[PDB]
Amino acid sequence: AQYEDGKQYTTLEKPVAGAPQVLEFFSFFCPHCYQFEEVLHISDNVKKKLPEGVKMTKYHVNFMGGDLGKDLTQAWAVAMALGVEDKVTVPLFEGVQKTQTIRSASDIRDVFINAGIKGEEYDAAWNSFVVKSLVAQQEKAAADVQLRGVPAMFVNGKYQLNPQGMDTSNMDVFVQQYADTVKYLSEK
C-alpha cells in the first residue's frame, strides 16, 4: 500500500476506547517538540487538513525534567482552563530550552504574567480543582497508551504517528506527509 502499518504509523495492540480523536503529547523539555512547535507548526498544519468536526487535543507530560516537568504539566492545565495556550506556548519553550530562564514554578508564572494573565487569576486557576482534574486527564491519557516518548500523536486511540518513517530532507515535505497521514488515519 502507500500507507503501511509500521511505516508512517504503528498500531496499538491495546486500543484505547473513548480516546480523543487527535491526541498530541509534548514536553517543554523535549527538543523535537520545540522543533514541532516553533519550526514545523505540526499541530497547526494537521488542523488545516483534518475533516470537519474533528477536535484536536494536546497534553503535557511529566517524565521529562523532574519537578519542573510536573510544574509544567500543572501550568499547561492552567493554560487549557484559561484558554491561553496560544499565548504561553512559545515563551515557555524558549524559557525552558532557549534562554533557560525558567528554573522554578515562579518563573513559569512570570511567563503568564508577561503574557497578560493576571496574578490573582493565575494563582486561582493554579490552585483550582478544575486544574487538578485537568492534570489528572493529562496523566490518564498518557498512562492509557504506555507513553514513554514525546512528541507523540495518536489518532482515535488506535494509531500512533511514526515520524521516523517519513523523509526529513525537506521540512515542508515532512510536515505535509505528517499531516496527510493524520488525515488518512482519521478516515480509517
Coordinates of N, CA, C and O in Angstrom, one line a residue:
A1 N 0.8 -1.2 0.0 CA 0.0 0.0 0.0 C 0.9 1.2 0.0 O 2.1 1.1 -0.1
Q2 N 0.3 2.4 0.2 CA 1.2 3.6 0.3 C 1.3 4.1 1.7 O 2.3 4.7 2.1
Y3 N 0.3 3.7 2.5 CA 0.4 3.8 3.9 C 0.4 2.4 4.6 O -0.6 1.7 4.3
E4 N 1.4 2.1 5.3 CA 1.6 0.8 5.8 C 1.8 0.9 7.3 O 2.6 1.7 7.8
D5 N 1.0 0.1 8.1 CA 1.3 -0.1 9.5 C 2.8 -0.5 9.6 O 3.3 -1.3 8.9
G6 N 3.4 0.1 10.6 CA 4.9 0.0 10.7 C 5.7 1.0 9.9 O 6.9 1.0 10.1
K7 N 5.1 1.8 9.0 CA 6.0 2.8 8.3 C 5.7 4.2 8.6 O 6.6 4.9 9.1
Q8 N 4.5 4.8 8.3 CA 4.2 6.1 8.7 C 3.5 6.2 10.0 O 3.3 7.2 10.6
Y9 N 3.1 5.0 10.5 CA 2.4 4.9 11.7 C 2.5 3.4 12.3 O 3.1 2.6 11.6
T10 N 2.1 3.2 13.5 CA 2.1 1.9 14.1 C 0.7 1.7 14.7 O 0.0 2.7 14.8
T11 N 0.4 0.5 15.0 CA -1.0 0.3 15.6 C -0.8 -0.2 17.1 O 0.1 -1.0 17.4
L12 N -1.6 0.3 17.9 CA -1.6 -0.1 19.3 C -2.3 -1.4 19.4 O -3.4 -1.6 19.0
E13 N -1.6 -2.4 20.0 CA -2.1 -3.7 20.4 C -3.2 -3.7 21.4 O -3.9 -4.6 21.6
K14 N -3.2 -2.6 22.1 CA -4.1 -2.4 23.2 C -4.8 -1.0 23.0 O -4.4 0.0 23.5
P15 N -5.8 -1.0 22.1 CA -6.5 0.2 21.7 C -7.3 0.8 22.8 O -7.7 0.2 23.7
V16 N -7.3 2.2 22.8 CA -7.9 2.9 23.9 C -9.2 3.5 23.5 O -9.4 4.4 22.8
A17 N -10.3 2.9 24.1 CA -11.6 3.3 24.0 C -11.9 4.7 24.5 O -11.3 5.1 25.5
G18 N -12.8 5.4 23.8 CA -13.2 6.8 24.2 C -12.1 7.9 24.2 O -12.4 9.0 24.6
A19 N -11.0 7.5 23.6 CA -9.9 8.5 23.5 C -10.2 9.7 22.6 O -11.1 9.5 21.7
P20 N -9.6 10.8 22.8 CA -9.8 12.0 21.9 C -9.4 11.6 20.4 O -8.6 10.7 20.2
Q21 N -10.0 12.3 19.5 CA -9.8 11.9 18.1 C -8.3 12.1 17.7 O -7.7 11.1 17.2
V22 N -7.8 13.3 17.8 CA -6.4 13.5 17.6 C -5.8 14.0 18.9 O -6.1 15.0 19.5
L23 N -4.9 13.2 19.4 CA -4.3 13.4 20.7 C -2.8 13.5 20.6 O -2.0 12.6 20.2
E24 N -2.3 14.7 20.9 CA -0.9 15.0 20.9 C -0.2 15.2 22.3 O -0.8 15.8 23.2
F25 N 0.9 14.6 22.5 CA 1.7 14.7 23.7 C 3.0 15.4 23.5 O 3.7 15.1 22.6
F26 N 3.3 16.3 24.4 CA 4.6 17.0 24.3 C 5.2 17.3 25.7 O 4.5 17.1 26.7
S27 N 6.4 17.9 25.7 CA 7.0 18.4 26.9 C 7.8 19.6 26.5 O 8.4 19.7 25.5
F28 N 7.8 20.6 27.4 CA 8.6 21.8 27.1 C 10.1 21.6 27.3 O 10.9 22.4 26.9
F29 N 10.4 20.4 27.7 CA 11.8 20.0 27.9 C 12.3 19.2 26.6 O 13.5 18.9 26.5
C30 N 11.3 18.9 25.8 CA 11.5 18.0 24.6 C 12.0 18.7 23.4 O 11.3 19.6 22.8
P31 N 13.3 18.4 23.0 CA 13.8 19.2 21.9 C 13.1 19.0 20.5 O 12.9 20.0 19.9
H32 N 12.7 17.8 20.1 CA 11.9 17.7 18.9 C 10.6 18.4 19.0 O 10.0 18.9 18.0
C33 N 10.0 18.5 20.2 CA 8.8 19.2 20.5 C 8.9 20.7 20.2 O 8.1 21.4 19.6
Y34 N 10.1 21.2 20.6 CA 10.4 22.6 20.3 C 10.4 22.8 18.8 O 9.7 23.8 18.3
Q35 N 11.0 22.0 18.0 CA 11.0 22.0 16.6 C 9.6 21.9 16.1 O 9.1 22.7 15.3
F36 N 8.8 20.9 16.6 CA 7.5 20.6 16.2 C 6.6 21.8 16.3 O 5.6 22.0 15.5
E37 N 6.8 22.6 17.3 CA 6.0 23.8 17.6 C 6.6 25.0 16.9 O 5.9 25.7 16.1
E38 N 7.9 25.3 17.1 CA 8.5 26.5 16.6 C 8.8 26.6 15.2 O 8.6 27.7 14.5
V39 N 9.3 25.5 14.6 CA 9.8 25.5 13.3 C 8.9 24.8 12.3 O 8.7 25.3 11.1
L40 N 8.2 23.7 12.7 CA 7.4 23.0 11.8 C 5.9 23.3 11.9 O 5.1 23.2 10.9
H41 N 5.4 23.7 13.1 CA 4.0 24.1 13.3 C 3.1 22.9 13.0 O 2.1 23.1 12.3
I42 N 3.5 21.7 13.4 CA 2.8 20.5 13.1 C 1.4 20.5 13.5 O 0.5 20.3 12.7
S43 N 1.1 20.9 14.7 CA -0.3 20.9 15.3 C -1.2 21.7 14.3 O -2.3 21.4 14.1
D44 N -0.6 22.8 13.9 CA -1.4 23.7 13.1 C -1.7 23.2 11.7 O -2.8 23.3 11.2
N45 N -0.7 22.5 11.1 CA -0.8 22.0 9.7 C -1.7 20.8 9.7 O -2.3 20.5 8.7
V46 N -1.7 20.0 10.8 CA -2.6 18.9 10.9 C -4.0 19.4 11.0 O -4.9 19.0 10.2
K47 N -4.3 20.3 11.9 CA -5.6 21.0 12.0 C -6.1 21.4 10.6 O -7.2 21.1 10.2
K48 N -5.2 22.1 9.8 CA -5.6 22.6 8.5 C -6.0 21.5 7.5 O -6.6 21.8 6.4
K49 N -5.7 20.2 7.8 CA -6.1 19.1 6.8 C -7.2 18.2 7.3 O -7.7 17.4 6.6
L50 N -7.4 18.3 8.6 CA -8.4 17.5 9.2 C -9.8 17.7 8.7 O -10.2 18.9 8.4
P51 N -10.6 16.6 8.6 CA -12.0 16.7 8.3 C -12.8 17.7 9.2 O -12.2 18.1 10.2
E52 N -13.9 18.1 8.8 CA -14.8 18.9 9.6 C -15.3 18.1 10.8 O -15.7 17.0 10.6
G53 N -15.3 18.7 12.0 CA -15.9 18.1 13.1 C -15.0 17.3 14.0 O -15.4 16.8 15.0
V54 N -13.7 17.3 13.7 CA -12.7 16.6 14.5 C -12.0 17.6 15.4 O -11.5 18.7 15.0
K55 N -12.0 17.2 16.7 CA -11.3 18.1 17.7 C -9.9 17.6 17.9 O -9.5 16.4 17.9
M56 N -9.0 18.6 18.1 CA -7.6 18.4 18.4 C -7.2 18.6 19.9 O -7.5 19.7 20.4
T57 N -6.6 17.7 20.5 CA -6.2 17.8 21.9 C -4.7 17.7 22.1 O -4.0 16.8 21.4
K58 N -4.1 18.5 22.9 CA -2.7 18.5 23.2 C -2.4 18.4 24.7 O -2.9 19.3 25.4
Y59 N -1.7 17.4 25.2 CA -1.3 17.3 26.6 C 0.2 17.3 26.9 O 1.0 16.8 26.1
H60 N 0.6 17.9 28.0 CA 1.9 17.9 28.5 C 2.2 16.6 29.3 O 1.3 15.9 29.8
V61 N 3.5 16.3 29.4 CA 3.9 15.0 30.1 C 4.9 15.3 31.3 O 5.7 16.3 31.2
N62 N 4.9 14.4 32.3 CA 5.7 14.5 33.5 C 7.1 13.9 33.4 O 7.9 14.3 34.2
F63 N 7.3 13.0 32.5 CA 8.5 12.2 32.6 C 9.8 12.9 32.1 O 10.9 12.3 32.0
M64 N 9.7 14.2 31.7 CA 10.9 14.9 31.5 C 11.0 16.1 32.4 O 10.0 16.8 32.7
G65 N 12.2 16.3 33.0 CA 12.5 17.5 33.7 C 12.1 17.5 35.2 O 11.9 18.5 35.8
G66 N 12.0 16.2 35.7 CA 11.6 16.0 37.1 C 10.6 16.9 37.7 O 9.4 17.0 37.2
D67 N 10.9 17.7 38.7 CA 10.0 18.5 39.5 C 9.4 19.6 38.6 O 8.2 19.8 38.6
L68 N 10.2 20.2 37.7 CA 9.8 21.2 36.9 C 8.9 20.7 35.8 O 8.0 21.4 35.3
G69 N 9.1 19.4 35.4 CA 8.2 18.8 34.4 C 6.8 18.7 34.9 O 5.9 19.0 34.1
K70 N 6.6 18.4 36.1 CA 5.3 18.3 36.7 C 4.7 19.7 36.9 O 3.5 19.9 36.6
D71 N 5.5 20.7 37.3 CA 5.0 22.1 37.4 C 4.5 22.5 36.0 O 3.5 23.1 35.9
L72 N 5.2 22.1 35.0 CA 4.9 22.5 33.6 C 3.6 21.8 33.2 O 2.8 22.4 32.5
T73 N 3.4 20.5 33.7 CA 2.1 19.9 33.4 C 0.9 20.6 34.1 O -0.1 20.8 33.5
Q74 N 1.2 21.0 35.4 CA 0.1 21.8 36.0 C -0.1 23.2 35.3 O -1.3 23.6 35.2
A75 N 0.9 23.8 34.9 CA 0.8 25.1 34.1 C 0.1 25.0 32.8 O -0.6 25.9 32.4
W76 N 0.4 23.9 32.1 CA -0.4 23.7 30.9 C -1.9 23.4 31.2 O -2.7 23.9 30.4
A77 N -2.2 22.8 32.3 CA -3.5 22.6 32.7 C -4.2 24.0 32.9 O -5.3 24.2 32.5
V78 N -3.4 24.9 33.6 CA -3.9 26.3 33.8 C -4.1 27.0 32.4 O -5.1 27.6 32.2
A79 N -3.2 26.8 31.5 CA -3.3 27.3 30.2 C -4.6 26.8 29.5 O -5.3 27.6 28.9
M80 N -4.9 25.5 29.6 CA -6.1 25.0 29.0 C -7.3 25.5 29.6 O -8.3 25.9 28.9
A81 N -7.4 25.6 30.9 CA -8.5 26.1 31.6 C -8.8 27.6 31.2 O -10.0 27.9 31.0
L82 N -7.8 28.4 31.1 CA -7.9 29.8 30.8 C -8.0 30.1 29.3 O -8.4 31.2 28.9
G83 N -7.7 29.1 28.5 CA -7.7 29.3 27.0 C -6.6 30.1 26.5 O -6.8 31.0 25.6
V84 N -5.4 30.0 27.1 CA -4.3 30.9 26.7 C -3.2 30.1 26.2 O -2.0 30.5 26.3
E85 N -3.4 28.9 25.7 CA -2.4 28.1 25.1 C -1.6 28.8 24.1 O -0.4 28.7 24.1
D86 N -2.2 29.6 23.2 CA -1.6 30.2 22.1 C -0.7 31.4 22.6 O 0.1 31.9 21.8
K87 N -0.8 31.8 23.9 CA -0.1 33.0 24.4 C 1.1 32.6 25.2 O 2.0 33.4 25.4
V88 N 1.2 31.3 25.7 CA 2.3 30.9 26.6 C 3.1 29.9 26.0 O 4.3 29.7 26.4
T89 N 2.7 29.2 24.9 CA 3.4 28.1 24.4 C 4.8 28.5 23.9 O 5.8 27.9 24.3
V90 N 4.8 29.5 23.1 CA 6.1 30.0 22.6 C 7.1 30.5 23.8 O 8.2 30.0 23.8
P91 N 6.6 31.4 24.6 CA 7.6 31.8 25.7 C 8.0 30.6 26.7 O 9.0 30.7 27.3
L92 N 7.1 29.6 26.9 CA 7.5 28.5 27.7 C 8.6 27.7 27.1 O 9.6 27.4 27.7
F93 N 8.5 27.4 25.8 CA 9.5 26.6 25.1 C 10.9 27.4 25.1 O 11.9 26.8 25.4
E94 N 10.8 28.7 24.8 CA 12.1 29.5 24.7 C 12.6 29.7 26.2 O 13.9 29.6 26.3
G95 N 11.8 29.8 27.1 CA 12.2 30.0 28.5 C 12.9 28.7 29.0 O 13.8 28.8 29.8
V96 N 12.3 27.5 28.7 CA 13.0 26.3 29.1 C 14.2 26.0 28.3 O 15.3 25.7 28.8
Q97 N 14.1 26.0 26.9 CA 15.2 25.5 26.1 C 16.2 26.5 25.5 O 17.3 26.2 25.2
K98 N 15.7 27.7 25.2 CA 16.5 28.7 24.5 C 17.2 29.6 25.5 O 18.4 29.5 25.6
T99 N 16.5 30.4 26.3 CA 17.1 31.3 27.2 C 17.4 30.7 28.6 O 18.2 31.3 29.3
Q100 N 16.8 29.6 28.9 CA 16.9 28.9 30.2 C 16.7 29.8 31.4 O 17.5 29.8 32.3
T101 N 15.7 30.6 31.3 CA 15.3 31.5 32.4 C 14.1 30.9 33.2 O 13.7 31.5 34.1
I102 N 13.7 29.7 32.8 CA 12.7 29.0 33.6 C 13.3 27.9 34.5 O 13.7 26.9 33.9
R103 N 13.3 28.1 35.8 CA 14.0 27.3 36.7 C 13.1 26.9 37.9 O 13.5 26.1 38.7
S104 N 12.0 27.5 38.0 CA 11.1 27.3 39.1 C 9.7 27.6 38.7 O 9.4 28.1 37.6
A105 N 8.7 27.2 39.5 CA 7.3 27.4 39.3 C 7.1 29.0 39.2 O 6.2 29.4 38.3
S106 N 7.8 29.7 40.0 CA 7.6 31.2 39.9 C 8.1 31.7 38.5 O 7.4 32.7 38.0
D107 N 9.1 31.2 37.9 CA 9.5 31.6 36.6 C 8.4 31.2 35.6 O 8.2 32.0 34.6
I108 N 7.8 30.1 35.8 CA 6.7 29.7 34.8 C 5.6 30.7 34.9 O 5.1 31.2 33.9
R109 N 5.2 31.0 36.2 CA 4.2 32.0 36.4 C 4.5 33.4 35.7 O 3.6 34.0 35.1
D110 N 5.8 33.8 35.8 CA 6.2 35.0 35.2 C 5.9 35.1 33.7 O 5.4 36.1 33.2
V111 N 6.1 34.0 33.0 CA 5.7 33.9 31.6 C 4.2 34.2 31.4 O 3.9 35.0 30.5
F112 N 3.4 33.7 32.2 CA 2.0 34.0 32.2 C 1.7 35.5 32.5 O 0.8 36.1 31.8
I113 N 2.3 36.0 33.5 CA 2.1 37.5 33.8 C 2.5 38.4 32.7 O 1.8 39.3 32.3
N114 N 3.7 38.1 32.1 CA 4.1 38.8 30.9 C 3.2 38.7 29.7 O 3.1 39.5 28.9
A115 N 2.6 37.5 29.6 CA 1.6 37.3 28.5 C 0.3 37.9 28.8 O -0.6 37.9 28.0
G116 N 0.2 38.6 30.0 CA -1.0 39.3 30.3 C -2.1 38.7 31.2 O -3.2 39.3 31.3
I117 N -1.9 37.5 31.6 CA -2.8 36.8 32.6 C -2.5 37.4 33.9 O -1.4 37.7 34.3
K118 N -3.6 37.7 34.7 CA -3.4 38.4 36.0 C -3.0 37.5 37.1 O -3.4 36.3 37.2
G119 N -2.1 38.0 38.0 CA -1.6 37.2 39.1 C -2.6 36.4 39.8 O -2.5 35.2 39.9
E120 N -3.6 37.2 40.4 CA -4.8 36.6 41.0 C -5.5 35.5 40.2 O -5.9 34.5 40.7
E121 N -5.6 35.8 38.9 CA -6.3 34.9 38.0 C -5.5 33.6 37.8 O -6.0 32.5 37.8
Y122 N -4.1 33.8 37.6 CA -3.3 32.7 37.5 C -3.2 31.8 38.8 O -3.3 30.6 38.8
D123 N -3.0 32.5 39.9 CA -2.9 31.8 41.2 C -4.1 31.0 41.5 O -4.1 30.0 42.1
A124 N -5.3 31.6 41.2 CA -6.6 31.0 41.5 C -6.8 29.7 40.6 O -7.2 28.7 41.1
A125 N -6.5 29.9 39.3 CA -6.5 28.7 38.4 C -5.5 27.6 38.9 O -5.9 26.5 39.2
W126 N -4.3 28.0 39.1 CA -3.2 27.1 39.6 C -3.7 26.2 40.7 O -3.4 25.0 40.7
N127 N -4.4 26.8 41.6 CA -4.9 26.1 42.8 C -6.3 25.5 42.7 O -6.7 24.9 43.6
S128 N -6.9 25.6 41.5 CA -8.3 25.2 41.4 C -8.4 23.6 41.2 O -7.5 23.0 40.6
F129 N -9.5 23.1 41.7 CA -9.7 21.6 41.4 C -10.1 21.4 40.0 O -9.9 20.2 39.5
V130 N -10.5 22.4 39.2 CA -10.7 22.2 37.8 C -9.3 21.9 37.2 O -9.2 21.0 36.4
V131 N -8.3 22.6 37.7 CA -7.0 22.4 37.2 C -6.4 21.0 37.6 O -5.8 20.4 36.9
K132 N -6.8 20.6 38.8 CA -6.4 19.3 39.3 C -6.9 18.1 38.4 O -6.2 17.2 38.1
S133 N -8.2 18.2 38.0 CA -8.8 17.2 37.2 C -8.2 17.2 35.8 O -8.1 16.2 35.1
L134 N -7.8 18.4 35.4 CA -7.2 18.6 34.0 C -5.8 18.0 34.1 O -5.3 17.5 33.1
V135 N -5.1 18.2 35.2 CA -3.8 17.5 35.4 C -4.0 16.0 35.4 O -3.3 15.2 34.8
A136 N -5.1 15.5 36.0 CA -5.5 14.1 36.1 C -5.7 13.6 34.7 O -5.3 12.5 34.4
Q137 N -6.4 14.4 33.9 CA -6.7 14.0 32.5 C -5.5 13.7 31.7 O -5.4 12.7 30.9
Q138 N -4.5 14.6 31.8 CA -3.2 14.6 31.1 C -2.5 13.3 31.4 O -2.0 12.6 30.5
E139 N -2.4 13.0 32.7 CA -1.7 11.8 33.1 C -2.4 10.6 32.7 O -1.8 9.6 32.2
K140 N -3.7 10.5 32.9 CA -4.5 9.4 32.5 C -4.4 9.0 31.0 O -4.1 7.9 30.6
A141 N -4.4 10.0 30.1 CA -4.3 9.8 28.7 C -3.0 9.2 28.3 O -2.8 8.3 27.5
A142 N -1.9 9.7 29.0 CA -0.6 9.3 28.8 C -0.4 7.8 29.3 O 0.3 7.0 28.7
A143 N -1.0 7.6 30.5 CA -0.9 6.3 31.1 C -1.6 5.3 30.2 O -1.1 4.2 30.0
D144 N -2.8 5.6 29.6 CA -3.6 4.7 28.8 C -2.8 4.2 27.6 O -3.1 3.1 27.1
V145 N -1.8 4.9 27.1 CA -1.0 4.4 25.9 C 0.4 4.1 26.3 O 1.2 3.9 25.4
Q146 N 0.7 3.9 27.5 CA 2.0 3.5 27.9 C 3.1 4.4 27.3 O 4.1 3.9 26.8
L147 N 2.9 5.7 27.4 CA 3.7 6.6 26.7 C 5.1 6.8 27.4 O 5.2 7.2 28.5
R148 N 6.2 6.5 26.6 CA 7.5 6.8 27.2 C 8.3 7.7 26.3 O 9.5 8.0 26.5
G149 N 7.6 8.3 25.3 CA 8.3 9.3 24.5 C 7.5 10.4 23.9 O 6.3 10.2 23.6
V150 N 8.1 11.5 23.7 CA 7.4 12.7 23.0 C 8.4 13.2 22.0 O 9.6 13.0 22.1
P151 N 7.9 13.9 20.9 CA 6.5 14.2 20.6 C 5.8 12.9 20.2 O 6.4 12.0 19.7
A152 N 4.5 12.8 20.5 CA 3.7 11.6 20.1 C 2.4 12.1 19.8 O 1.9 13.0 20.4
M153 N 1.8 11.5 18.7 CA 0.5 11.7 18.3 C -0.3 10.4 18.1 O 0.3 9.4 17.6
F154 N -1.5 10.4 18.5 CA -2.4 9.2 18.5 C -3.6 9.6 17.8 O -4.1 10.6 18.1
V155 N -4.1 8.7 16.9 CA -5.4 9.0 16.2 C -6.5 8.0 16.6 O -6.3 6.8 16.4
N156 N -7.6 8.5 17.2 CA -8.7 7.7 17.6 C -8.3 6.5 18.5 O -8.8 5.4 18.4
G157 N -7.3 6.8 19.4 CA -6.9 5.8 20.3 C -6.4 4.4 19.7 O -6.3 3.5 20.5
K158 N -6.1 4.4 18.4 CA -5.6 3.1 17.8 C -4.4 3.3 17.1 O -3.6 2.3 17.0
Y159 N -4.1 4.5 16.5 CA -2.9 4.6 15.7 C -1.9 5.6 16.2 O -2.3 6.7 16.7
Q160 N -0.6 5.4 16.1 CA 0.4 6.2 16.6 C 1.3 6.7 15.4 O 1.8 5.9 14.7
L161 N 1.5 8.0 15.3 CA 2.3 8.5 14.2 C 3.7 8.0 14.3 O 4.2 7.9 15.4
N162 N 4.3 7.8 13.2 CA 5.7 7.3 13.1 C 6.6 8.2 12.3 O 6.9 7.9 11.1
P163 N 7.0 9.4 12.8 CA 7.7 10.4 12.0 C 9.1 9.9 11.6 O 9.6 10.4 10.6
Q164 N 9.6 8.9 12.3 CA 10.9 8.2 11.9 C 10.8 7.7 10.4 O 11.8 7.6 9.7
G165 N 9.6 7.2 10.0 CA 9.4 6.6 8.7 C 9.0 7.6 7.6 O 8.4 7.1 6.6
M166 N 9.3 8.9 7.7 CA 9.0 9.9 6.7 C 10.3 10.6 6.3 O 11.3 10.4 7.0
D167 N 10.4 11.3 5.2 CA 11.6 11.9 4.8 C 11.8 13.3 5.4 O 10.9 14.1 5.5
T168 N 13.1 13.6 5.8 CA 13.4 14.8 6.5 C 14.4 15.7 5.8 O 15.0 16.6 6.4
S169 N 14.5 15.5 4.5 CA 15.4 16.3 3.7 C 14.8 17.7 3.6 O 15.5 18.7 3.7
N170 N 13.5 17.7 3.4 CA 12.7 19.0 3.3 C 11.7 19.1 4.4 O 10.8 18.3 4.5
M171 N 11.9 20.0 5.3 CA 11.0 20.3 6.4 C 9.5 20.4 6.0 O 8.6 20.0 6.7
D172 N 9.3 21.1 4.9 CA 7.9 21.4 4.5 C 7.3 20.1 4.0 O 6.1 19.8 4.2
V173 N 8.0 19.3 3.3 CA 7.5 18.0 2.8 C 7.3 17.0 4.0 O 6.3 16.3 4.0
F174 N 8.1 17.1 5.0 CA 8.0 16.3 6.2 C 6.6 16.6 6.9 O 5.9 15.7 7.2
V175 N 6.3 17.9 7.0 CA 5.1 18.4 7.6 C 3.9 17.9 6.9 O 2.9 17.3 7.5
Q176 N 3.8 18.1 5.5 CA 2.7 17.6 4.8 C 2.4 16.1 4.8 O 1.3 15.7 4.9
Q177 N 3.5 15.4 4.8 CA 3.4 13.9 4.9 C 2.8 13.5 6.2 O 2.0 12.6 6.3
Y178 N 3.3 14.2 7.2 CA 2.8 14.0 8.6 C 1.3 14.3 8.7 O 0.6 13.5 9.2
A179 N 0.9 15.4 8.2 CA -0.5 15.9 8.3 C -1.4 15.0 7.5 O -2.5 14.5 8.0
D180 N -1.0 14.7 6.2 CA -1.7 13.8 5.4 C -1.9 12.4 6.0 O -2.9 11.7 5.8
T181 N -0.9 12.0 6.8 CA -1.0 10.7 7.4 C -2.1 10.8 8.5 O -2.9 9.9 8.6
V182 N -2.1 11.9 9.3 CA -3.1 12.1 10.3 C -4.5 12.0 9.6 O -5.4 11.4 10.2
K183 N -4.6 12.6 8.5 CA -5.9 12.7 7.8 C -6.3 11.3 7.3 O -7.4 10.9 7.6
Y184 N -5.4 10.6 6.7 CA -5.6 9.2 6.3 C -6.1 8.4 7.5 O -7.1 7.6 7.4
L185 N -5.3 8.4 8.6 CA -5.7 7.6 9.8 C -7.0 8.0 10.3 O -7.8 7.2 10.8
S186 N -7.3 9.3 10.2 CA -8.6 9.8 10.7 C -9.8 9.3 9.9 O -10.8 9.1 10.5
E187 N -9.6 9.0 8.6 CA -10.7 8.5 7.8 C -10.8 7.0 7.8 O -11.8 6.4 7.3
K188 N -9.8 6.4 8.5 CA -9.7 4.9 8.5 C -10.8 4.3 9.3 O -10.6 3.4 10.1

